[PDB]
């Protein structure tokens, strides 16, 4: 209620310790802080974790109570609800290991609980579909920033982190700082009166750009007709038909983005999906393989790589993709029968699911409505990156595994290039033979974070 003043009190922080493989990490914890005045669901609380040194007027890794980065990791995947995380958490989903390590590194951690597509209110009504996920994320950020003087850590040093849909969440938070679109929702919730722009973005396999993900997925995977996920199926003739068309539309969609390489060239595709853009994707995968190759990895686990001497000199992209195989059916995101996580994400309190593309709406196999166009745009990070603003984070780190079939490589790549083209800081890679996952590279994420702030 309005009785909740959203004022953090450091006296709430209580001492805890966790074993970190070979070390005891000392920290303080304050849990279950209601970060808005009018929450609609029990999941909307946040946890705060602070390196113990900061309660003692002491230091960690060059950081102190006033200056420490604030890592804001989330637990969201598949656009499902993400519970407030905890270094003591053993229940799925959780990044407790990442949190333990962040604390060891001197970062303040604010782990906020986030509504998702299956979330219901006290009346059994759905309250977690779009744009619930990002509203909650923003509200948590506002709580932190409103509480700058009282919450340990520098509120101007907030760095979000997430994997998959959580990566999209992290990316959207960075792109959309202080967007007016979300104001009515944040006001209806009674969020803290503060800004929600952040300092830096960490994103693993962000599942974003949903309205173009079907085109990208088929551009990558057309010609490979069996799919295998969690079960192993084969594409029907209808799906093969939709696939070939979806692939072609991607070229049109890609060319008009006017993406540029470092030399300033327009990155493009022809009617067959071949061209300088495809070449860029290939080079990032070659680069990925070389790094792995240099470490003594057997890259011929997958097909297509050409090795000359000690160098990966080329790659048969089609052979590689064939060996990697195919995870999702067609369309991969906007299912004609509305059965995808994203369909459900775009539903609302009346409709369990909606389409989010004209093609899938036109070809729907069930009665359906199309999601509001403004909403689709609003939850796409690219929407905010057509320009250089203050509200967009300056620093980005994006990772998508080179063995990851949850979305086309083109999706995170487009994001990275757009960020580069519009002058934002962007650190991008496709780490070799990494599955659907995140936080497997903390030494590098933390060195990157330290690089921005020290
Ligand atoms: Hg992934
Ligand atoms: Hg700093």
- Nearest ligand to the CA of 400 is 1
> CA torsion 258→261→265→269, rounded to 10°?
-60
Neighbours of ion ligand 1 (CB under 5 A): 205, 404, 406, 436
Q: How many domains does the chain have?
A: 1
User: Residues followed by a break in the chain, C–N over 2.5 Å?
Assistant: 230
Convert the chain into a string of H (helix), E (strand) and C (coil): CCCCCCCCCHHHCEEEEEEECCEEEEEEEEEEECCECCCCCCCCCEEEEEEHHHHCCCCECCECCCCCCEEEECCCCCCCCECCCCCCCCCCCCCHHHHHHHHHHCCEEEEECECCCCCECCCCCECCCCCHHHHHHHHHHHHHHHCCCCCCCCHHHEEEECECHHHHHHHHHHHCCCCHHHHHHHHHHCECCCCCCCCEEEEECCCCCHHHHHHHHHHHHCCCCEEECCCEEECCHHHHHHHHHHHHHHHHHHHCCCCECCCCCECCCCCCCCCHHHHHHHHHHHHHHHHHHCCCCCHHHCCCEEEECCEEEEECHHHHHHHHCCCCCCCCCCCCCCCCHHHHHCCCCCCCCCECCHHHHHCCCCCCCECCHHHHHHCCHHHHCCCCCCCCCCEEEEECCCCCCCCCCHHHHHHHHHHHHCCCEEEEECCCCCCCCCCCCHHHHHHHHHHHHC
Bridge-based pairing state of the strands 23-33 and 14-20 = antiparallel
Length of the chain: 454
Distance CA 141, CA 144 (A): 5
**Cis before 93? omega within 30:** yes
CA atoms within 13 A on the CB side of 6: 23
For 208, the token pair is 């974003």
Which residues, other chains included, contact 192 with Cβ-Cβ below 8 Å and sequence gap of 6+? 6, 35, 36, 139, 142, 143, 145, 146, 147
Report the separation in Å between the CA atom of 76 and the middle of ligand 2, taken as the mean of its atom positions.
27
Residues in binding site = 78, 165, 328, 342, 406, 436
- Number of Cβ within a 10 Å radius of residue 12: 14
Cβ–Cβ < 8 Å for 38, 6: no
Nearest to 145 by CA among 82, 73, 198, 76: 198
- CATH assignment at residue 401: 3.40.50.1820
34 CA to middle of ligand 1, Å?
Answer: 31
HSE-CB of 196 using CA atoms within 13 angstroms:
27
Instruction: Name the residue range of residue 207's domain.
Output: 1-454
Q: Which ligand has the minimum distance to the alpha carbon of residue 63?
A: 2
Place of tokens 């070449």: 279
Rounded to whole angstroms, what are the CA distances from 43 to 36, 80, 181, 193?
A: 12, 12, 23, 21
């Amino acid at each position: 209620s309005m009785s909740n003043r959203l004022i953090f009190d450091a006296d709430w922080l209580v001492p805890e310790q966790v074993q970190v493989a070979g070390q005891a990490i000392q920290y303080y914890a304050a849990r279950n802080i209601q970060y808005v005045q009018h929450p609609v669901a029990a999941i909307q609380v946040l946890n705060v974790f602070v390196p113990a040194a900061y309660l003692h007027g002491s230091s960690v890794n060059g950081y102190q109570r006033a200056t420490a980065p604030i890592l804001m990791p989330n637990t969201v995947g598949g656009y499902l609800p993400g519970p407030a995380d905890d270094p003591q958490r053993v229940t799925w989903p959780t990044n407790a290991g990442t949190i333990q390590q962040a604390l060891k590194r001197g970062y303040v951690v604010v782990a906020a609980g986030i509504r998702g597509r299956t979330t219901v209110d006290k009346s059994g009504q759905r309250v977690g579909q779009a744009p619930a996920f990002i509203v909650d994320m923003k509200a948590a950020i506002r709580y932190v920033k409103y509480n700058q003087g009282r919450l340990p850590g520098d509120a101007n040093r907030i760095i979000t982190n997430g994997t998959s849909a959580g990566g999209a969440t992290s990316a959207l938070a960075g792109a959309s700082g202080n967007s007016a679109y979300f104001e009515p929702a944040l006001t209806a919730l009674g969020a803290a009166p503060a800004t929600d722009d952040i300092f830096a973005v960490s994103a693993y396999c962000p599942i974003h750009n949903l309205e173009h993900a079907d085109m990208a997925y088929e551009w990558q995977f057309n010609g490979i007709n069996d799919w295998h996920r969690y079960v192993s199926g084969q594409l029907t003739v209808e799906e093969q038909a939709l696939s070939l068309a979806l692939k072609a539309q991607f070229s049109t969609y890609l060319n008009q983005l006017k993406l540029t390489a470092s030399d300033g060239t327009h990155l493009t595709l022809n009617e067959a999906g071949m061209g300088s853009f495809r070449d860029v994707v290939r080079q990032l995968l070659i680069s990925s393989a070389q790094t792995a190759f240099d470490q003594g990895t057997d890259i011929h686990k997958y097909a297509g790589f050409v090795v000359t001497g000690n160098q990966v000199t080329d790659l048969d992209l089609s052979a590689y993709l064939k060996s990697l195989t195919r995870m999702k059916a067609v369309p991969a995101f906007d299912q004609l029968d509305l059965t995808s996580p994203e369909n459900n994400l775009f539903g609302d309190a009346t409709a369990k699911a909606k389409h989010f593309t004209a093609l899938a709406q036109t070809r729907s196999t069930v009665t359906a409505q199309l999601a509001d166009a403004e909403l689709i745009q609003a939850i796409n990070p690219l929407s905010y990156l057509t320009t250089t603003s203050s509200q967009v984070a300056k620093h980005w780190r994006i990772r998508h595994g080179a063995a990851d079939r949850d979305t086309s490589f083109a999706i995170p790549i487009i994001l990275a290039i757009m960020l580069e083209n519009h002058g934002y800081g962007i650190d991008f890679a496709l780490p070799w033979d990494i599955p659907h996952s995140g936080d497997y590279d903390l030494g590098d994420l933390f060195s990157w974070i330290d690089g921005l702030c020290q």
